[PDB]
Structure 1
């Protein structure tokens, strides 16, 4: 028997097989979880991608900017898992920031519409997804979104850092809401995962700072962590952040 046996879990954020949500999905199904999956735009592609998953799973469309997608999302899931059934888990692995706000572009050159669009997608959508889905979730359930420690500024990450700080603050509020349904809300703050010279420097220090090391080619440790929060072995943790970063954020040098 597996970690997530009989639990019905919605996973968003699969675009390729390198996506963190592919591995979360992969590992959740390995542990006996019944998935519903959502995707944004390139649906034809992600049909073939999610076929490379261990088990079959209905695939729905969900642009988190789209207001019709959100209002219909409860009924579409319910149809997909069968009326009378409910979700025990929800995975948010969605994030986007335009290259105007992340990377080489100077922090001060990002226009607000672009920053606004990235904050919409990477932080606010955690609330509106929880809002869509909370009415069709069982007590004991668990919502989990993906994070990248924003405690300190770093190069490149720029406005995506700022989006992740907003996400964290959003997580604490969603938990207030989720808790009235007896449902937990947490973030997994992951280390860098391989989905210019400066960026190599960060990733390098990550493995060096990590007391147990950090392999950027391996997404499984993060998938596992998420399934831990989706399981029942972490039942008194909510509003919170769990770090799957090799322990790097706990070490200065």
Structure 2
């Protein structure tokens, strides 16, 4: 008797057992969801990781920059869940920005690197929704991972720009998803240890737990995974094109 009992949910973005998507997948399975997982590039390695989840789940290859992968995705998911069955949820937990656009001066990132980062981190949220909406049930839910990019910060540079673009994409995806009776939302998380940039990240994370009224544990992805599962559930049925902040309330406090 789980929060997601009988729901068929696709979860992308597992690379390690520290990945936010690994925790989202774990909590969803504990809550009765039947999963379909998608992995990028290191498929043999991802299968070794996903074996650590509480239940077996089919693993499909998905490189969001690969148009052929996107074109075959719905068909491959239908084969995995059975003809006549559709998805109730989709989790986008994919992000990438080359080291020139993260960590290196903001002005020194070449556009080919920024473009690749925006493709994977923002445009792919629209790509995945385009591919999967035709195989989603009414009352369904699409959830993506974000971080608050409303204010600039050290080091995250072009990845912050990519998140600003992702929040805008999310609002357009909601217009399309609504036609199917599906919601589209992002979860803006606090910093999670998933694996002078070092001094910047340290100062960011320190200021986090201090600014958060309920505190913030950077080593624990469970509160974020639970928030994603709340959006996948039937309990936020009138929320779409929106952002839910799972950050300990830090974005609501100046100091």
What is the CA deviation profile of residues 90-144 of structure 1, one whole-angstrom value per residue up to 9, with x for unaligned ones? 00000000000001x0000000000000000000000010000000000000000
Which residue number corresponds to residue 199 of structure 1? Answer: 201
SS of the residue 2:180 aligns to: coil
**1:227 matches 2:226:** no
**1:177 matches 2:179:** no
- Give distance in 2, aligned partners of 1:147 and 1:106: 23
Deviation (angstroms), 1:156: 0.4
- Give distance in 2, aligned partners of 1:113 and 1:176: 30
- Give distance in 1, aligned partners of 2:57 and 2:17: 15
- Give distance in 2, aligned partners of 1:221 and 1:192: 12
What is the CA deviation profile of residues 64-95 of structure 1, one whole-angstrom value per residue up to 9, with x for unaligned ones? 00000000000000000000000000000000
Deviation (angstroms), 1:197: 1.7
SS of the residue 1:114 aligns to: helix
Structure 2: gaps (5+ residues): none
Runs of 4+ in 1 over 2 A off after TM superposition: none
What is the CA deviation profile of residues 174-198 of structure 1, one whole-angstrom value per residue up to 9, with x for unaligned ones? 0000000000000000000001122
How many equivalent residue pairs? 252
- Give distance in 2, aligned partners of 1:47 and 1:128: 24
- Give distance in 1, aligned partners of 2:130 and 2:5: 25
Structure 1: gaps (5+ residues): none
SS of the residue 2:238 aligns to: coil
- Give distance in 2, aligned partners of 1:98 and 1:46: 21
What is the CA deviation profile of residues 20-71 of structure 1, one whole-angstrom value per residue up to 9, with x for unaligned ones? 0000000000000000000000000010100000000000000000000000
TM-score normalised by L of structure 2: 0.99
SS of the residue 1:141 aligns to: strand
SS of the residue 1:3 aligns to: coil
Deviation (angstroms), 1:199: 1.5
- Give distance in 1, aligned partners of 2:83 and 2:223: 34
- Give distance in 1, aligned partners of 2:147 and 2:115: 19
